[PDB]
Amino acid sequence: LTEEQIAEFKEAFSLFDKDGDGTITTKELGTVMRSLGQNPTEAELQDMINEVDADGNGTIDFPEFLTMMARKMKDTDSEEEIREAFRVFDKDGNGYISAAELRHVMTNLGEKLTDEEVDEMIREADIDGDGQVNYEEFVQMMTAK
Ligand SMILES: [Ca+2]
Ligand SMILES: [Ca+2]
Ligand SMILES: [Ca+2]
Ligand SMILES: [Ca+2]
Nearest to 58 by CA among 67, 66, 49: 49
Own/partner pairs, 85-93, CB within 8 angstroms, 24+ separation: 85/138, 86/135, 86/138, 89/133, 89/138
1-75 CATH? 1.10.238.10
Residues near 121 by beta carbon (within 8 Å), at least 6 away in sequence: 99, 102, 113
Residues 18, 42: Cα–Cα separation, whole Å: 18
Give resolution in angstroms.
1.9
141 alpha carbon, closest ligand: 4
> Annotated binding site, which residues?
17, 19, 21, 23, 28, 53, 55, 57, 59, 64, 90, 92, 94, 96, 101, 126, 128, 130, 132, 137
Q: Report every protein residue that has its C-beta within 5 angstroms of ion ligand 1.
A: 17, 19, 21, 23
> Annotated binding site for Ca(2+), which residues?
17, 19, 21, 23, 28, 53, 55, 57, 59, 64, 90, 92, 94, 96, 101, 126, 128, 130, 132, 137
Report how far ligand 1's centroid is from the alpha carbon of 96 (Å).
43
Specify the experimental method: X-ray
Residues of the chain with CATH 1.10.238.10: 1-75, 76-145
76-145 CATH? 1.10.238.10
Residues 46, 38: Cα–Cα separation, whole Å: 15
